[PDB]
Amino acid sequence: GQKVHPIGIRLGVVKRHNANWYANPKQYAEYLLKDLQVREFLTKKLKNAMVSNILIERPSGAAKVTISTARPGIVIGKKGEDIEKLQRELTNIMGVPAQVSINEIDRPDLDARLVAEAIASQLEKRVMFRRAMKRAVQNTMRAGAKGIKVEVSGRLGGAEIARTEWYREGRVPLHTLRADIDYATMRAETTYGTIGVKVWIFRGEILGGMKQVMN
Amino acid sequence: TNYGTGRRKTATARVFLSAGTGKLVINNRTLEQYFGRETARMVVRQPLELLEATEKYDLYITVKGGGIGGQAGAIRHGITRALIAADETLKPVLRQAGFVTRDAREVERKKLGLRKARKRPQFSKR
Amino acid sequence: PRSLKKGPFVDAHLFAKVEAAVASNSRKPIKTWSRRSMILPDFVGLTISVHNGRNHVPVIVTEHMVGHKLGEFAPTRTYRGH
Amino acid sequence: PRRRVVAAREILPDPKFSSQTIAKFMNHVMQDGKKSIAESIVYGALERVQEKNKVDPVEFFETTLEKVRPMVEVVPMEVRPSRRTALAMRWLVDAAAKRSEKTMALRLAGELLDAAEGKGAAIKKREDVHRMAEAN
Amino acid sequence: AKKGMINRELKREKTVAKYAAKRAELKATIANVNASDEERFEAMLKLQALPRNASPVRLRNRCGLTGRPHGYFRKFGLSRNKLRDTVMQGDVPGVVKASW
Amino acid sequence: NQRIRIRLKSFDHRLIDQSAQEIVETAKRTGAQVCGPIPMPTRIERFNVLTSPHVNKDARDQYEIRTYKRLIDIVQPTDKTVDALMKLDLAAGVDVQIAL
RNA sequence: CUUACCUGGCCUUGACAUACUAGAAACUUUUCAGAGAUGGAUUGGUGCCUUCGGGAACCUAGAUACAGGUGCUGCAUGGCUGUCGUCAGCUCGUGUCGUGAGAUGUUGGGUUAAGUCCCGCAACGAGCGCAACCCUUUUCCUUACUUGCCAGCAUUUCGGAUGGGAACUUUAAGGAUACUGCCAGUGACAAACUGGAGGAAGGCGGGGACGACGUCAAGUCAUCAUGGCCCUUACGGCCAGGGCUACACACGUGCUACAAUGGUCGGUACAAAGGGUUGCUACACAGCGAUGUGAUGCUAAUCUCAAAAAGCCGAUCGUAGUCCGGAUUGGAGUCUGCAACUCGACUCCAUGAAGUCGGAAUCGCUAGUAAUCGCGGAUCAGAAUGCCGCGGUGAAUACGUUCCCG
Ligand SMILES: CN(C)[C@@H]1C(=O)C(C(N)=O)=C(O)[C@@]2(O)C(=O)C3=C(O)c4c(O)c(NC(=O)CN5CCCC5)cc(F)c4C[C@H]3C[C@@H]12
Ligand SMILES: [Mg+2]
Ligand SMILES: [Mg+2]
Ligand SMILES: [Mg+2]
Ligand SMILES: [Mg+2]
Ligand SMILES: [Mg+2]
Ligand SMILES: [Mg+2]
Ligand SMILES: [Mg+2]
Ligand SMILES: [Mg+2]
Ligand SMILES: [Mg+2]
Ligand SMILES: [Mg+2]
Ligand SMILES: [Mg+2]
Ligand SMILES: [Mg+2]
Ligand SMILES: [Mg+2]
Ligand SMILES: [Mg+2]
Ligand SMILES: [Mg+2]
Ligand SMILES: [Mg+2]
Ligand SMILES: [Mg+2]
């Protein structure tokens, strides 16, 4: 059978949205499209800055974009020149002034997205998939996650028949709604096609409901 | 003097019960004008009929929501509750009759892939 | 049917051809693609070649035709039985 | 159902004569939820029989149902107490439907009166069932 | 969708924008009672004489990320394929899975 | 005869409640009198989205979005009340409309 | 239009990107030919920064690397989805047993919706699945008192209409409550199951989301992305007409009926959820009518779509292919659209087909369910008998597991 998206099913329960603004029924479509183009532009521009989360807000006739990165210095720039340029481009994409805030990630090994990129880059660089999966699964557990799962699908090693291999340590209770689960997907484009990577990380359970997160 | 609230299938009834002679007004109408189904009138009359207190009280009732049966049931529940408020010693006999309970049955929602809540499209193997 | 308050519809490029033909006395057929134009009294006595999708079919307009659309006299499907 | 004794439903006594027999007969008459029409038909029939002969409506109906009730049905098998009542209630309305009086209530009253004497279509149907029961 | 279809839709939208004002004026003239019948007839002819791509009826809603011409959902301006993916990642504010 | 009407709209009732409570606290501290917040009926918009790309018409996701509304009235306002309300910061996700 | 197909007319570094070279602000007003695509004429203007030497945008002309492809491969793939099936399974550590691969645990008696739980037992214990944590409904409490409410007062054009009240309904956030908690049987003194009091509710209360390990090289290169193979004056791109709506036939899924538990006419009650500013429209007048014109209130618990319909009372029809049924056809109209011939919906007059309850066979449903009645929305200029939702009225029957299917 097919499985529901781990974050979507938790969106209202123990997880927050990545977009937080109000809009009348007429401006909703335009705001959504401009936000999506902003996300595409940031994803392209900041490939090498170890950026996972992008949070967009529109307080009042203005935009605030918060970028979660493991390498804040690369995005910020030596003299802070890069942030001003990023603000100018984001304002050009938007129709209102935009300001950027940076959130440093203290533990890159507990973020599903960064782990996914780490595996995908190696797979493109022709590292054995089992070796990469075991290395990631061990690093996360040593970092302190209660559980992690990795899955890789496609023509592994350039074989004619594609297959799927998965590896897990710890516990990953997907069915428990209040469980805190990080999930991500990434594509690795190789000479023989595309290999898909999926990563689950279980970090513990949230007690108190969505209220404790102060929604 | 005493008050009661009755509910049945999306119908809510406000009942005010006072010591009187037997007048009964619903929504500024009279019982036979408001209900044309005699069974509804008898359902409404059941509570005081049981206690033989028809001529010992007056009733001023407003009702809203639901249909004929729902509104009749809501009025009966409200009159029962007003009688309980007036006197507690009545509650045993009223519970034995069954007027204390609030009927919780409601329409079931239609479900994706189905014609109704449970009814399913006709099936054919070939 | 089109509302009477708006009046009959005729393509202007076909109306100009019709007016020129009636002003002259040229019996040469008028080639058109306007199957949607209304046949007016001024069209009577004229031949209009109406497209059917692959060919233009000639139609000689009589009085009984007035009020019809031009495409009504140019069938678009071929069929001779099963 | 292979694992449960599903309990029998309990239908409220009728709001006029407080009789479950009349309630069940009313439900048998009712089609597609038109309880008001079924109630009118049955209550009019009962009033008509009462006017024609002055007897308690409930007693006459119970007595007639007792006459109309089958004994056994076909290896022959004895039917349980509820099934006989269901069959009699069904056949009474079935015969009333094919009767040819003006309105449904009036023809139901006529059928009940005829069955009480024994010269009725329902009683004849019961006699035919009894005749066929002798096959085994 | 083929890039030609997207370009066709863009061209039609620009054409409608280029003629909105003239179209509105012409239809107002047509609907104007106080004007003479001749002026209204000229207005009708001028209205029919515009390029066809001036008519809004020829615009078709497309996804906005893929150009799909089916399943539009005016509220979001995306088609179902992209809407499902974008909602399930938490990128569309206020939208959650519905149970009642 | 001056009475300030505040209307709040949001897609998150927790955020709307926080904003409304902040408004009431600010008004009470400045010294005016307030009525509310009064909860208005919520709007619920629902959507059905096919989950398969091609042909599975029974495989759908059901989504909803909820618009929550709150109403507050400030009567007998002091001079500092208007300035304090204006200086109050704006929080993303909540729309605030002030009518005088 | 969409549109990928057919006929004919047309362009070629291209409708779309980047790189190089040169000239022009971009733009903008009126014509002519043409079915249009196109082509050729033709008015108005000289913009924003400059260390003003040149630059930004946006156009025109040349050039080649290139663009472009809903063309093939779902059997080369990612992502997504159906199915068994919400079926109850899937496994590890440590121990023991075997030369071994491995085995036990997970098997046996009951019980449960359940590998659910208890019994026994070289097994002792734990993870993913089950269940629970999330949404909604039934009872009650706190906060809130407008645009929603009206029990007591008054004023009333008898309309909560007004002054007023914060009681009640309701709106919507937060809380409480059910736990086999108490009683009698019952079983192994267990688990569990029966029957009682209280309680709005009693033994996972009722529904929704949530899909384990895996199966069918099952579906999708026509949402999208992607390896490889193909076309490049055409398998790319632009346009007007036609087709996707054909019609000796055969199937699946639906609607409407065959009538009296009904049809028609007159009078008169009771909802819930949704939609509305290029929109919904009170009210007046015109029209038999679909609608038209004027005008009013609404960005909405404020105005509005809006008439709920089955129901109740009264009259008539008296079992007839009918005062049942409403197909088809002839006339005459309204609206949306540049445009209703091919090929829209709706209105009025006339017409009045099959159909008398449907063969062998076969489908859904265990309760607020089936059946029956109306109401709303996404798509959308216009175009639902489909789909997704909402409420009104409201049944029958389950002895039981032999037989059929999984
Ligand atoms: C009745 N029908 C729906 C079948 C059915 O019912 C079932 C089922 N499970 O019951 C199904 O399997 C199917 O639907 C299906 O999907 C199949 C395929 O894919 C497939 C295929 O791809 C290739 N591939 C090639 O020949 C490529 N070669 C490379 C070199 C030259 C050619 C060869 C081939 F025989 C097949 C078999 C089909 C069968 C088909
Ligand atoms: Mg409901
Ligand atoms: Mg229903
Ligand atoms: Mg006609
Ligand atoms: Mg493409
Ligand atoms: Mg269209
Ligand atoms: Mg076409
Ligand atoms: Mg396949
Ligand atoms: Mg579960
Ligand atoms: Mg296949
Ligand atoms: Mg296929
Ligand atoms: Mg065309
Ligand atoms: Mg078709
Ligand atoms: Mg009648
Ligand atoms: Mg008729
Ligand atoms: Mg016949
Ligand atoms: Mg069941
Ligand atoms: Mg429409």
Automatic annotation (TrEMBL), chain A:
Residues 38-106 form the KH type-2 domain. Keywords: Ribonucleoprotein, Ribosomal protein, RNA-binding, rRNA-binding. GO terms for cellular component: cytosolic small ribosomal subunit. SMART domains: KH. GO terms for molecular function: mRNA binding; rRNA binding; structural constituent of ribosome. It comes from the Bacteria. Pfam families: KH_2, Ribosomal_S3_C. Signal peptide: none annotated. InterPro entries: KH_dom, KH_dom-like_a/b, KH_dom_type_2, KH_sf_prok-type, Ribosomal_S3_C_sf, Ribosomal_uS3, Ribosomal_uS3_bac-typ, Ribosomal_uS3_C. The keyword Ribonucleoprotein applies. Part of the 30S ribosomal subunit. Forms a tight complex with proteins S10 and S14. PANTHER family: 30S/40S RIBOSOMAL PROTEIN S3, SMALL RIBOSOMAL SUBUNIT PROTEIN US3C. Belongs to the universal ribosomal protein uS3 family. NCBIfam families: rpsC_bact (TIGR01009). This is Small ribosomal subunit protein uS3. The lineage of its organism: Bacteria, Pseudomonadati, Pseudomonadota, Gammaproteobacteria, Moraxellales.
TrEMBL record, chain B:
GO terms for molecular function: RNA binding; structural constituent of ribosome. Gene3D superfamilies: 3.30.230.10. It comes from the Bacteria. One of its GO terms (biological process) is translation. The keyword Kinase does not apply. It holds the Pfam family Ribosomal_S9. The keyword Ribonucleoprotein applies. GO terms for cellular component: cytosolic small ribosomal subunit. Keywords: Ribonucleoprotein, Ribosomal protein. Belongs to the universal ribosomal protein uS9 family. NCBIfam families: PRK00132.1. This is Small ribosomal subunit protein uS9.
